[PDB]
Amino acid sequence: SVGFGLVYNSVAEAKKFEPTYRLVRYGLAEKVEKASRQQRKQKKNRDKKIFGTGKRLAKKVARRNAD
Amino acid sequence: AKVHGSLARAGKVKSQTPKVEKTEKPKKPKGRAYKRLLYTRRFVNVTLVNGKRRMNPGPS
Amino acid sequence: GKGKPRGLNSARKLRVHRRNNRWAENNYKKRLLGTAFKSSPFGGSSHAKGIVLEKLGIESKQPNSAIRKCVRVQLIKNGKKVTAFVPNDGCLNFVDENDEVLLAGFGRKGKAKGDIPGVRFKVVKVSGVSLLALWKEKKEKPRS
Amino acid sequence: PRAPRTYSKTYSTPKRPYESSRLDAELKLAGEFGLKNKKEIYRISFQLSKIRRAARDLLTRDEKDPKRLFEGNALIRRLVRVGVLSEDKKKLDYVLALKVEDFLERRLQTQVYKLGLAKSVHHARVLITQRHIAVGKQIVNIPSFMVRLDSEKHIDFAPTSPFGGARPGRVARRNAARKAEASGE
RNA sequence: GGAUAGUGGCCUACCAUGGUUUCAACGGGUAACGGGGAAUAAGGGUUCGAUUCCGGAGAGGGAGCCUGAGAAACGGCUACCACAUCCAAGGAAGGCAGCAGGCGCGCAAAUUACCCAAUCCUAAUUCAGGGAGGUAGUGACAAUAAAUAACGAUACAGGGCCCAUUCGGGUCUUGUAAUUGGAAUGAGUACAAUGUAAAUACCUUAACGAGGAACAAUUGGAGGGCAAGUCUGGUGCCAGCAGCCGCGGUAAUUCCAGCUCCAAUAGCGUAUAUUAAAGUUGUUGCAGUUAAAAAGCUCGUAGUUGAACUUUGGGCCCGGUUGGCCG
RNA sequence: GGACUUUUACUUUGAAAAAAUUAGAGUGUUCAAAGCAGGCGUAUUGCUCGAAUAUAUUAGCAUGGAAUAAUAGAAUAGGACG
RNA sequence: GCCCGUCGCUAGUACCGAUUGAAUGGCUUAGUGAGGCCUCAGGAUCUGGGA
Ligand SMILES: [Mg+2]
Ligand SMILES: [Mg+2]
Ligand SMILES: [Mg+2]
Ligand SMILES: [Mg+2]
Ligand SMILES: [Mg+2]
Ligand SMILES: [Mg+2]
Ligand SMILES: [Mg+2]
Ligand SMILES: [Mg+2]
Ligand SMILES: [Mg+2]
Ligand SMILES: [Mg+2]
Ligand SMILES: [Mg+2]
Ligand SMILES: [Mg+2]
Ligand SMILES: [Mg+2]
Ligand SMILES: [Mg+2]
Ligand SMILES: [Mg+2]
Ligand SMILES: [Mg+2]
Ligand SMILES: [Mg+2]
Ligand SMILES: [Mg+2]
Ligand SMILES: [Mg+2]
Ligand SMILES: [Mg+2]
Ligand SMILES: [Mg+2]
Ligand SMILES: [Mg+2]
Ligand SMILES: [Mg+2]
Ligand SMILES: [Mg+2]
Ligand SMILES: [Mg+2]
Ligand SMILES: [Mg+2]
Ligand SMILES: [Mg+2]
Ligand SMILES: [Mg+2]
Ligand SMILES: [Mg+2]
Ligand SMILES: [Mg+2]
Ligand SMILES: [Mg+2]
Ligand SMILES: [Mg+2]
Ligand SMILES: [Mg+2]
Ligand SMILES: [Mg+2]
Ligand SMILES: [Mg+2]
Ligand SMILES: [Mg+2]
Ligand SMILES: [Mg+2]
Ligand SMILES: [Mg+2]
Ligand SMILES: [Mg+2]
């Protein structure tokens, strides 16, 4: 079997010059799991509809339950 | 000519040729083996040179 | 020299005269007039799918006495109307009026086949399936 | 938008489809070197056809012309390599000769048979396709491998399978399971 | 002069009468985006190129314009035209010839999946984003390798061959066999590790996994062209076949079947197109008395074509490149 | 640097020239279609061959040739050199 | 023996043809003319003549 190997001058270097997924294989990194790449896309888009922070948008829609 | 001649007989003969079913036979080898069988037939053993050479004879 | 200019600048006349005379070629003129796209019941396309009007009983040309069994089809992309033949014994019992069918040519480049006068196409499928398969038994004719 | 994956076809088919003479002449070839296709002959006669074409073209050029001398000599040395062209006949007027059986004779299926190992050319086919016989420890399972000169000596069973040592087969070892179970405990 | 980034009838004002054309202008057609190229293999050609790269054009159709270095931009805006969606009827809102997916259209064409790991691109930027792109699913578009078996035993039969006065079978294998004989391998299934961004497959590899019930090859064809039967049964100018020639009206070598046989074989038939065959478009290279074809006749412009003759013979020099007999 | 040159066709050799495709060299992707790799050791801290060549014709450029075929020349001499 | 044309039947193609017939696409006269852009004005307001 032929492959390819690397060996770093120290483990401060390995953790910095390595792919983040490689460390995963090894046990030198937790798989920071995240939302479906499309869920994230959709989170972005849902956000574009809101100009500013928005807490002022929760309150004005709380006047809705008056009209 | 004529374009509205009878249609009743469509499928006549196929419908009335008495069925007989295929006879279960030995299986024939597929691939290279089959070309082999042909070679030993056509050339190696040889059968009859009845004047010339025959391929599908019956009641010769 | 009989005819054709032999000279060294006579290349224009030599092409023109060739352009000219190509027209006497059947398939060149068919091609360039676009006879396909214009005449021809199909588009110029390989097959065409139409709908079955009446079931015909075409009597064969001499010295052949028989009844040839066909279908008048009305091409779907077209409304062009066409009689087509239904190959193999029976098979007409497969079709019925108002059915969909697939028509292909007869392999005579235009031109009708044998003793069948007028017919330039043949059926290939019906109600979605394959006339051939229905003949054998590999398939069966769809509900409606 | 990604580069064309290039490809080529590797056969030609008989112009005349039902030539009784060609037809027999082809079958015996198969029957001899254990082919399964007419294509296995077709493929070769195609390989042949170009080589002739190359050579034909070369010959037209001037004797001692650069391309002719370059590519001509290249073609010759390569044919020599696999052992189609003999050493004497080393000057391409003969690659211009050169029939199909020459090629045929140099397949791994044919060589595996020629000396020992196989006994009958078909057993030769089956052994190869079945992960026995090798070149180095490099196992080869293509009957058309075409054996280079320095390799003829290194055709032999592989360090695996039985034959070339180390474990019998799954079915033998399955009968050893029907010996010590019935008669023993 | 004005306008433009800037040349220029680009536009305007004055003035003039020019510009193109049988060496085909101008007009029409195009089921026309141009190119690199593709298919066909004596050569000369013929046909094709929406389509992985380069150029150009477009974003439902037109025009207009803001921003900006760069757009006459459409995943920008404005107007009209055509579609068209939501409503509380007041109004508001859309532009898949991006990726997928749907309708329609038709002979005709796949997933509303995963990822930024690679290739690279962008930003304030090593980090974010990227349906660019890559991954996988669908997939007999094309192209490559090539399993469906391999070896011995026996039973008569043989042809070899020494002898043959005559039994014969005997050891060299030719193989057709209705009991036989053990060996082999992956198609699959699957620990495992490899693979991968994560998976899947491939490459490896424990455990399993072949005797005919199989892990059981097809597709056409068997009168001629054209490789393969004058078998048997059926039909009776019917039913069907047949590219073409031709078969079928009661012994069918063409139909419908069984048997057997051929060809190509994981592929083979059919339909349409085109290329070769085609020297049936002919420059290479056709034909024209009678087969298709010399204009009734002469003049004649364009076009093509067009006799011979003008420094040739002789002398000197240099240095190359193959090859010979010698090395 | 000054002062002036009858026109052309043809052919030669050369430059300018994108890649993929095509032809074709090298390399045993297990074979092959492909790909542009790969190969050697001290396989413990590296050594090293590559990633050719050809074609690319019409037009434009540049150079050699002076056969073949055009062109222009001096006759009311308004000729040629000085 | 061969064979020609009218006349008669079935089926198919194309032609002529009242309908000053119909349809789609490309330009286009005359009239009407949105919109943005340029320009003559304007001046809610909001400042130091300008906006
Ligand atoms: Mg994201
Ligand atoms: Mg934000
Ligand atoms: Mg004519
Ligand atoms: Mg009718
Ligand atoms: Mg339509
Ligand atoms: Mg002017
Ligand atoms: Mg005028
Ligand atoms: Mg003309
Ligand atoms: Mg177009
Ligand atoms: Mg084109
Ligand atoms: Mg193109
Ligand atoms: Mg198009
Ligand atoms: Mg644009
Ligand atoms: Mg659209
Ligand atoms: Mg318009
Ligand atoms: Mg726009
Ligand atoms: Mg855009
Ligand atoms: Mg309301
Ligand atoms: Mg889409
Ligand atoms: Mg869009
Ligand atoms: Mg398809
Ligand atoms: Mg990123
Ligand atoms: Mg930071
Ligand atoms: Mg994507
Ligand atoms: Mg099978
Ligand atoms: Mg079995
Ligand atoms: Mg069959
Ligand atoms: Mg025959
Ligand atoms: Mg009978
Ligand atoms: Mg019979
Ligand atoms: Mg039969
Ligand atoms: Mg074929
Ligand atoms: Mg010539
Ligand atoms: Mg002729
Ligand atoms: Mg005549
Ligand atoms: Mg005459
Ligand atoms: Mg002359
Ligand atoms: Mg040149
Ligand atoms: Mg190149």
Determine contact, residues D128/D112, Cβ cutoff 8 Å: yes
Rounded-to-5 percentages of helix, strand, coil across chain B: 30, 0, 65
Q: How far apart are alpha carbons B17 and D23 in whole angstroms?
A: 37
D36 min Cα distance to partner chain B (Å) = 4
Q: Do C92 and B11 touch (CB under 8 A)?
A: yes
How far, in Å, from the CA of A35 to the mean position of ligand 1? 9
* C97 in contact with chain B, both atoms CB, cutoff 8 A: no
Compute the radius of gyration of chain B from its Cα atoms.
22
How far, in Å, from the CA of A51 to the mean position of ligand 16? 29
Determine contact, residues C47/C104, Cβ cutoff 8 Å: yes
Q: How far apart are alpha carbons C25 and C12 in whole angstroms?
A: 21
Dihedral-angle region of residue C38 (phi above 0 means left; psi in -120 to 50 means alpha; beta otherwise): alpha
Q: How far apart are the first and last CA of chain A?
A: 74
Q: How far apart are alpha carbons D111 and D125 in whole angstroms?
A: 11
Residue C71, beta-bridge partner list: C55, C84
Q: How far apart are alpha carbons C50 and C69 in whole angstroms?
A: 17
- Closest by Cβ to B1, choosing from C69, C90, C117: C117
Q: Do chains D and C touch (3 or more CB pairs under 8 A)?
A: no
Give the residue among C79, C81, C73 at the shortest CA–CA distance from C125: C73
Chains that touch B (3 or more CB pairs under 8 A): C, D
- Provide the CA C81 to C1' G22 distance, Å, integer: 22
Cβ-based contacts of B10 with chain C (< 8 Å):
69, 90-93
Residue C122, beta-bridge partner list: C85, C104
Q: How far apart are alpha carbons C80 and C124 in whole angstroms?
A: 18
Domain boundaries, chain C: 1-144
Cβ-based contacts of C92 with chain B (< 8 Å):
7, 10-11
* D177 in contact with chain B, both atoms CB, cutoff 8 A: no
For every residue of chain C, DSSP letters joined together read --SS---SSTHHHHHHHHHHHHTTSHHHHHHHHTHHHHSSSS-SSSEEEEEEEEEEBPBPPTT---B--EEEEEETTT--EEEEE--SSS-TTT--TT-EEEEEE-SSSSS--SS-SS--EEEEEETTS-HHHHHHSS------
Taking each helix axis from N to C end, the angle separating D20-33 and D39-60, rounded to the nearest 10 degrees, works out to 110
On the CB side of D143, CA atoms within 13 Å amount to 22
* D77 in contact with chain B, both atoms CB, cutoff 8 A: no
The pair of structure tokens assigned to C77 is: 């992309």
The pair of structure tokens assigned to A31 is: 């798989």
Q: How far apart are alpha carbons A67 and A55 in whole angstroms?
A: 20
Q: How far apart are alpha carbons D94 and D104 in whole angstroms?
A: 17
Chains that touch C (3 or more CB pairs under 8 A): B
Q: Do B32 and D24 touch (CB under 8 A)?
A: no
Method of determination used here: X-ray
Determine contact, residues D177/D183, Cβ cutoff 8 Å: no
The pair of structure tokens assigned to D32 is: 């001899």
Amino acid identity, residue D20?
Answer: S
